[PDB]
Design a protein around this ligand. Structure first.
Ligand SMILES: [Cl-]
Length: 171
């Protein structure tokens, strides 16, 4: 398997097959391994990027995850003042379409390359959580908060979905 983004070393986490062949996916068990500190001797810091819309996040998210659905906010939070360290790892998730997750992952890499001299990067190691929150929650509900799940297409939030869509850079 290839090395991480800045070609400094191997990817640390075991991966699983996902839709995008070129992206790295991890399972809920691996996400819990990180959260429970199984990689504490190697991973100095990791960030869980929940790119679902706010109402989804508010209805139940993984503990410590940061809600960054808009590219500009993700860029600002991650790249305005780079979270340096050991390894730093980012985990993105926003399942159930328009490829939010993969797109955000690719966007951050694009911006990281743009502010660095090749091949250096602030976030050389990034993964996608396989199955997103929908598959994580029924496996480890006590690692979520609140302990619930609110789908993007929840009948009662059809307007919140539209309202938020109108704040994106492109559709
Ligand atoms: Cl956006």
């Amino acid at each position: 398997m290839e090395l991480i983004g800045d070609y400094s070393k191997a990817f640390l986490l075991q991966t699983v097959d996902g839709k995008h062949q070129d992206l790295k996916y991890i399972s809920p068990e691996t996400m819990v391994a990180l959260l429970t500190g199984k990689f504490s001797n190697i991973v100095d810091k990791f960030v869980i990027v929940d790119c679902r819309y706010p109402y989804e996040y508010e209805g139940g998210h993984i503990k410590t995850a940061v809600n960054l659905p808009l590219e500009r906010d993700a860029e600002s939070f991650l790249l305005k003042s780079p979270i340096a360290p050991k390894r730093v790892i980012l985990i993105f998730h926003c399942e159930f379409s328009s490829e939010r997750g993969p797109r955000m992952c690719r966007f951050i890499r694009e911006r990281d390359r743009a502010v660095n001299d090749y091949p250096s990067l602030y976030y050389p190691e990034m993964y996608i959580l396989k199955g997103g929150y929908k598959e994580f929650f029924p496996q480890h509900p006590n690692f979520c908060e609140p302990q619930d799940y609110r789908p993007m297409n929840h009948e009662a939030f059809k307007d919140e979905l539209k309202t938020f869509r109108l704040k994106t850079r492109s559709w």
